Amino acid sequence: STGSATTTPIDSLDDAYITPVQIGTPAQTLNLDFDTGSSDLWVFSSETTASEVDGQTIYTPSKSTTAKLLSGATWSISYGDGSSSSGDVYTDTVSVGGLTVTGQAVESAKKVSSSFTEDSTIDGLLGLAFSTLNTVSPTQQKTFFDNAKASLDSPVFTADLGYHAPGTYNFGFIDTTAYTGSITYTAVSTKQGFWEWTSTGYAVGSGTFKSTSIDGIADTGTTLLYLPATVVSAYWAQVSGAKSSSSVGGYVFPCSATLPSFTFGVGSARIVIPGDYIDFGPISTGSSSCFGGIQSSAGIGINIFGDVALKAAFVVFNGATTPTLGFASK
Ligand SMILES: N=C(N)NOCC[C@H](N)C(=O)O
């Protein structure tokens, strides 16, 4: 089997991407944030505290003839931005882009934190990291991908995120028309439950490439590119007036600037992020200070190749017995 679904930016800055997902019978379609940095599929629901729902589409398990309470199971998750959610669990039929999994754990939110409530466009998350991070207790549950894997033509999914445009998540096949050149594959460590890999270095603009190992994670659920302070300082040093602002919470730059590109290494290959991808707009409405899309990972504890980096590539998440990651230009 295979699946193919379009993913669409939620706003003009590509802060996140939503992908429609069919849950239950008859189908209830919710727009989920596909997240290769976590492993829970959770949704706003009829059980979510009413004051914590503001415009989201909800899953109502009582209206699904295939929903079943997973007795005794609860879940609770906290994300890197300090956001959180928790609730109970149903099993139900879940389909993405024509690919159907029966008996998928659908984690129904009873509570969500304010940042979730405030984002009316995101109806929940669909985790695509390794199932070892799944938070369901007392019986850990499998991700949609892990459940689908055996049925897929090939045990892979791909992320093809657009810049200010829709893109695609494919399951079970590699669309050879979706990228240019060849895909370069690189080793993955699953020891922390993430799609963790080692970049071979970087360049800033037209500068020379610096060969240096940068361990990090391929994370579709993180907006920005978080890298060591040395790397990030070398980038922003090439932008007149750029500075790190503790009050704003990162590097900012004059909105009048034209940003340089940033290149990262994948083996002997190179992925170029155009400068425009690194512009996240005014820090507040009408401001002439703009927020940078490359930020320091110091204090996070891990480097994160988030959407800013991933949307510059066609990315293969290869879930074979020994997982690997593939990157191509596009
Ligand atoms: N960051 C990852 N990978 N997952 O979830 C992201 C949702 C969270 N509120 C955030 O904005 O970070």
Domains of the chain and CATH, by start: 5-174 (2.40.70.10), 175-330 (2.40.70.10)
Q: Does ligand 1 have an atom closer than 6 angstroms to the CB of 39?
A: no
The last residues before gaps in the chain (C-N over 2.5 Å) are none
The token duo for 306 is 């988030």
Q: Does ligand 1 have an atom closer than 6 angstroms to the CB of 221?
A: yes
Residue 199 falls in the annotated catalytic set: yes
Reduced 3-state DSSP string for the chain: CCEEEEEEECCCCCCCEEEEEEECCCCEEEEEEEECCCCCEEECECCCCHHHCCCCCCECHHHCCCCEEEEEEEEEEECCCCCEEEEEEEEEEEEECCEEEEEEEEEEEEEECHHHHCCCCCCEEEECCCHHHCCCECCCCCCHHHHHHHHCCCCEEEEECCCCCCEEEEECCCCCCCCCCCCEEEECECCCCCCEEEEEEEEECCCCCEEEEEEEEECCCCCCEEECHHHHHHHHCCCCCCEEECCCCEEEEECCCCCCCEEEEECCEEEEECHHHHEEEECCCCCCEEEECEEECCCCCCEEECHHHHCCCEEEEECCCCCEEEEECC
Contacts 24+ apart (CB under 8 A), 81-86: 81/115, 82/113, 82/115, 83/113, 83/114, 83/115, 83/116, 84/112, 84/113, 85/42, 85/109, 85/111, 85/112, 85/113, 85/116, 86/110, 86/111
Phi, psi of 192 (to 5 degrees): -105, 5
Method for this entry: X-ray
Q: Does ligand 1 have an atom closer than 6 angstroms to the CB of 219?
A: yes
Report which residue type is found at 23: I
- CA separation for the pair 133, 80 (Å, rounded): 14
Q: Which residue, among 171, 40, 208, 164, has the nearest Cα to 108 in the 3D structure?
A: 40
- CA separation for the pair 306, 115 (Å, rounded): 19
Number of Cβ atoms within 10 Å of the Cβ of 197? 21
Cα–Cα distances in angstroms (integers) from residue 59 to residues 56, 96, 98, 118, in the given order? 10, 15, 19, 18
The token duo for 317 is 């998440």
162 backbone φψ class: left, alpha, beta (φ>0; ψ -120 to 50): beta
For a mutational test of ligand 1's pocket, the pick from 17, 31, 56, 79, i.e. the residue with the most ligand atoms closer than 8 A to its C-beta, is 79
The token duo for 22 is 């069919």
Q: Does ligand 1 have an atom closer than 6 angstroms to the CB of 326?
A: no
Contact 293, 282 (CB under 8 A): no
- CA separation for the pair 235, 216 (Å, rounded): 18
Sheet holding 279-282, edge to edge: 243-245, 250-254, 289-292, 279-282
Residue 219 falls in the annotated catalytic set: no
- CA separation for the pair 215, 201 (Å, rounded): 10
Could you tell me which residues come within 8 angstroms of residue 285 by beta carbon, excluding any fewer than 6 positions away? none
- CA separation for the pair 140, 253 (Å, rounded): 44
83 backbone φψ class: left, alpha, beta (φ>0; ψ -120 to 50): beta
Could you tell me which residues come within 8 angstroms of residue 30 by beta carbon, excluding any fewer than 6 positions away? 20, 21, 23, 43, 44, 57, 58, 59, 123, 124
- CA separation for the pair 51, 67 (Å, rounded): 25
Resolution (A): 1.4
Contact 212, 264 (CB under 8 A): no
Burial group, residue 100, by CB count within 10 angstroms (0-12, 13-18, 19+): middle
Report which residue type is found at 270: R
Q: Which one of 14, 35, 119, 307 is the catalytic residue? A: 35
Kind of pairing between the strands at 41-43 and 99-112: parallel
